[PDB]
Each structure stands twice: as structure tokens, then as C-alpha cells.
Design a protein around this ligand. Structure first.
Ligand code: TAP
Length: 182
């Protein structure tokens, strides 16, 4: 007769645009989900607009993000993202504590804090993008489902994390549009 629960929060599109329009420095960490949804394009358009608004928007790529080495880099470059704003984990990781908003798009295992928080975890020690250290984190995936490593991710139930559920492309097409309506 045992039980444990977890509480996560979900925000809506409009609320999302606020955090985005309010943040000065943003870091986007894409993963397998962004690929499966083919959301390189909408998120690239969005990043373009936000950058023309004086906002500092950059991507943080995990070495083993997606399903092939440097796969996210290729997809972003195909969408037009400036190679200069696409940084690797080791180069941008120390900037999470100084970031206003981290948009986690279709990523999970690569931003799993259990790597550092749970000693009995199968990914214990594995380097991860420390997104939970920034001010506000918005996780964009279809649910609180697991990733490749089939392991629960603690950042879902963290105070500074908000879940914006839905296909990575539908969501990104929406934010892209609503940010244009600004
Ligand atoms: N890159 C290489 S070389 C490679 C090779 C083999 C294995 N791996 C492993 O694969 C993992 C990759 O890390 P990651 O962060 O990219 O991966 P996962 O942790 O694989 O992330 C996939 C996440 O995206 C979501 N997703 C899937 N389709 C989506 C969609 N259409 N729209 C929005 N979200 C969607 C999933 O959640 P929902 O189901 O809730 O949407 C899922 O939890 C690592 O564990 C790595 O070790 C990498």
C-alpha cells in the first residue's frame, strides 16, 4: 500500500507569448521531438522575429540530441538558423543561470535533472543541458511521457517549469503567429 504523486503545471499559448515577450535572454534546447514534428521552420521564423526585437535568442544542442550525431544542427541549418546562434552544450551550459527563458522543444532525456539529482538513476552522471537553472522553463512536448531512456524527468514537477502540451510543430506555428501579431 504505497503511493507517491507529482504536480506539474500547464500554461496556455497566450501565457506562453507573455513569458516570451517578457524575457530578454532566451535559450532554446531542441531534441528528438522537434525532428519528428519537423518544427525547425516555425521555431526558426520565431527566433528571427525575436532577434529583430533586440532579444537574445540562442539554441543549446546536446551532443546526443535526436537520433543521429549533430542531427539537430542539420535541421536547424536547413531552416535558416544562423550557425552563430546555434551553440553546443559545453559552450552554453554555463549560461543557464543567467537566462530568463528556456524553451525546451521536443527534448527530454537531454534536459533530465535526474542525472544530477538521483544517484540511483540509470542516467546518473550523464551530462545534461541544465535548463532548470534558468529563471523560467517552458517544456514543449505532447505530454509528460518519457523519452528514449524511458525514464521520468524531474524538471516536469519543478516550480519554475511550465508544460505547454501539443505537437512541437502545431505549438511552434501558433507561437510564431501570435508573436507576429505583436
Ligand atoms: N543523437 C544520437 S547519436 C542518439 C542515438 C541513439 C539514442 N539516442 C538517445 O536519444 C535521446 C535523445 O534525447 P532527446 O532529448 O532528443 O530525446 P527523448 O528524450 O528521446 O525526447 C523525445 C521527446 O520529444 C517528445 N516528442 C516526440 N514527438 C513529439 C512531437 N511530435 N511533438 C512534440 N514533442 C514530441 C517526447 O515526448 P511526448 O511523447 O510527450 O511528446 C519525448 O519525450 C537520448 O537519451 C540519447 O541518448 C541519441
Amino acid at each position: 500500500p504505497m503511493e507517491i504523486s507529482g504536480t506539474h503545471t500547464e500554461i496556455n499559448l497566450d501565457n506562453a507569448i507573455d513569458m516570451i515577450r517578457e524575457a530578454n535572454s532566451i535559450i532554446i534546447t531542441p531534441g528528438y521531438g522537434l525532428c519528428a514534428a519537423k518544427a525547425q521552420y516555425p521555431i526558426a521564423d520565431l527566433v528571427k522575429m525575436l532577434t529583430e526585437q533586440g532579444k537574445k535568442v540562442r539554441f543549446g544542442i546536446h551532443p546526443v540530441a535526436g537520433r543521429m550525431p549533430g542531427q539537430l544542427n542539420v535541421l536547424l541549418a536547413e531552416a535558416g538558423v544562423p550557425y552563430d546562434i546555434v551553440l553546443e552544450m559545453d559552450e552554453i551550459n554555463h549560461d543557464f543561470p543567467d537566462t530568463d527563458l528556456v524553451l525546451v522543444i521536443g527534448a527530454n532525456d537531454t534536459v533530465n535533472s535526474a542525472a544530477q539529482e538521483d544517484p540511483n538513476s540509470i542516467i546518473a552522471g550523464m551530462p545534461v543541458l541544465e535548463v532548470w537553472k534558468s529563471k523560467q522553463v517552458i517544456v514543449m512536448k505532447r505530454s509528460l511521457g518519457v523519452g528514449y531512456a524511458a525514464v521520468d524527468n524531474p524538471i516536469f514537477y519543478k516550480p519554475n517549469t511550465a508544460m505547454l502540451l501539443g505537437d512541437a510543430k502545431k505549438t511552434c506555428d501558433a507561437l510564431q503567429a501570435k508573436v507576429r501579431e505583436s
